[PDB]
Amino acid sequence: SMENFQKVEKIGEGTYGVVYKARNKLTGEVVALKKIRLDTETEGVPSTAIREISLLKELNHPNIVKLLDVIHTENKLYLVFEFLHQDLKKFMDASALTGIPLPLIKSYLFQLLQGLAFCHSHRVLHRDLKPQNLLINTEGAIKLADFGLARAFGVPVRTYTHEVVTLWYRAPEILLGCKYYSTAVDIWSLGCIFAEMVTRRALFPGDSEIDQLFRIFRTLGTPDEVVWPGVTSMPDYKPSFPPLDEDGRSLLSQMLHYDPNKRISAKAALAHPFFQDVTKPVPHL
């Protein structure tokens, strides 16, 4: 069953399960196997696994991680992913002193936006985009991964789960308890991630919900009409951030617009002036 997979090492745990690195003994194919324990007397197959498996079968794009196979047993379930060298977080940390070349940041952002635009085009919210859920190989590609907090949405969207996105990457509409939220939330995350590739430090590292919001309220600016912005009625405020060219700074503040209805779409961002010259460098591993 898993007699052809030979285990190499552990590579972490995510929304759910333990992920190991493995080699197909017959083809030599290197893979990652997410192993999901089933509760066969209790809750059966976890909802997170039902969503990731189903949604990741729809989603066949080169900037979305590739589910390959799903191996069932009576007591175990194994997801066979394509293996990617490491995650954006680890790369960012190795890149803490050297920096990440600004060409590569464009490349990574561009790929992430193609990837996420593909998700949104297909009724899916990722809802947990964070550097630890983004995988890179040695040849300059990056891919969305961990679709355990993902979700197929309808049009218009309904109240979805509140407990979504890691705090730092969480859009304000979610923080403030908005009845609805949408594709906006994923962009916000990529906007936070854009910033983090540049500086290699997270942009809004709150210790608490309260602290998380205050770091955004600050970037917004001082009051105009709506005086306290901590209101479910998203007031109209876009942030300012005075090594990123004028274009770069615009894209960013479009991705980080406080009003979700005015925040750039992935599709839109793909056409932004920032990416006119965009190429595909390999990384320094």
Binding site: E41, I50, L55, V70, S121, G154, V155, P156, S182, K267
Partner: protein
């Protein structure tokens, strides 16, 4: 706003119309099913309605379950004594897929009046996933409907509640709704409600979206008019019981038009 996903509403509609074709059950799978019948399936689906109502599940969940069931029965012979266990398993799957706070597995065993054990419900769950190969993100009537609802001018709770009501009536009766696509059924139900409540008709806005004309939508619209008309006399009555309530503005109590003037 972005809650209506302006930049993606068409791309999504394209995809859902392709997926709706792919997720489609086999028309008249019931003839190949030695032991179960359409009438039996009507008892099941009606029971699923009640179950959704008891546990206050989304309407999306109900439609998913039914899709899960028809696809499963499209490929797996099932003895009647096991019909309810397929459907329980599916409601559970649909709940896990769709709800924020799905009921527990125990609650799915409670509603079967302990016809089945918890371990049968769970073993059916894995079987259902295997047979459907985890393809659970099936487009539904409700999903097209909600988009169609966007083209109203202005919006009408009654039409909404009444379009919902009619869509759901289709679930019960494999004949003749296995032979219409969710998109087509939803078009038909939207017209039929709009007409009843306003006298208005399938909007042009939605003719441009769907590529469906009242001409294209007539085989369906006739089957559903008949369904709407004979509804107070159907053996299954939970849908009507449901849409009498005020959450739905008692649209089950409104009187079907007599002629659609086609």
């Amino acid at each position: 706003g972005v809650n209506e996903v302006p930049d993606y509403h068409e791309d999504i509609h394209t995809y859902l119309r392709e997926m709706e074709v792919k997720c489609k059950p086999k028309v008249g799978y019931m003839k190949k099913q030695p032991d179960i019948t359409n009438s039996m399936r009507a008892i099941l689906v009606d029971w699923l309605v009640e179950v959704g109502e008891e546990y206050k599940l989304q309407n999306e969940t109900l439609h998913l379950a039914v899709n899960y069931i028809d696809r499963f029965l499209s490929s797996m012979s099932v003895l009647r004594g096991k019909l309810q266990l397929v459907g329980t398993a599916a409601m559970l799957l649909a709940s896990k897929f769709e709800e924020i706070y799905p009921p527990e597995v125990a609650e799915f065993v409670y509603i079967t009046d302990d016809t089945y054990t918890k371990k049968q419900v769970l073993r059916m769950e894995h079987l259902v996933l295997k047979v459907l190969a985890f393809d659970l993100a099936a487009p539904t009537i409700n999903q097209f409907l909600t988009q169609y609802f966007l083209h109203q001018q202005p919006a009408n709770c009654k039409v909404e509640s009444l379009a919902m009501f009619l869509g759901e009536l289709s679930l019960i009766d494999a004949d003749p709704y296995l032979k219409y696509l969710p998109s087509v059924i939803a078009a038909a139900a939207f017209h039929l409600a709009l007409y009843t409540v306003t006298g208005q008709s399938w909007p042009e806005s939605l003719v441009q979206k769907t590529g469906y004309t009242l001409e294209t939508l007539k085989p369906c619209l006739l089957d559903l008019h008949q369904t709407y008309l004979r509804a107070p006399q159907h053996a299954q009555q939970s849908i009507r019981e449901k849409y009498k309530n005020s959450k739905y503005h008692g649209v089950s109590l409104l009187n079907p038009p007599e002629t659609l003037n086609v």
